[PDB]
Symmetry: C2
Subunit: 62 residues, 2 copies
């Protein structure tokens, strides 16, 4: 139904250069909260929360 | 023109409970990179990168 967590699967190889932004969803019920909107095709995909470059990218935004 | 950084002003008092998600824009040219989509009215606003609860919210998402 409408009750499924929005991220079923995630991508593990997205390049920072290909991200327009990261969206961090306020979904405590769910295991996967990070979404990227991609530059090359304006697609939204869910991202591996262990993706190498994410921690520094978020830190730097603060 | 189209060359202005997207965040001119920011909000400093947004409640976490009222955020659907945070968007962290990949805009190194710009000083303000954090946007929230609000629960009460589906508006997007730019947020104070010093907002008390943001650091923990992002940390927890990783």
């Amino acid at each position: 139904l409408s009750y499924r967590c929005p991220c079923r699967f995630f991508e593990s190889h997205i390049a920072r250069a290909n991200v327009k932004h990261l969206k961090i969803l306020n979904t405590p019920n769910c295991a996967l909260q990070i979404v990227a909107r991609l530059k090359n095709n304006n697609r939204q995909v869910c991202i591996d929360p262990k993706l190498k470059w994410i921690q520094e990218y978020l830190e730097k935004a603060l």
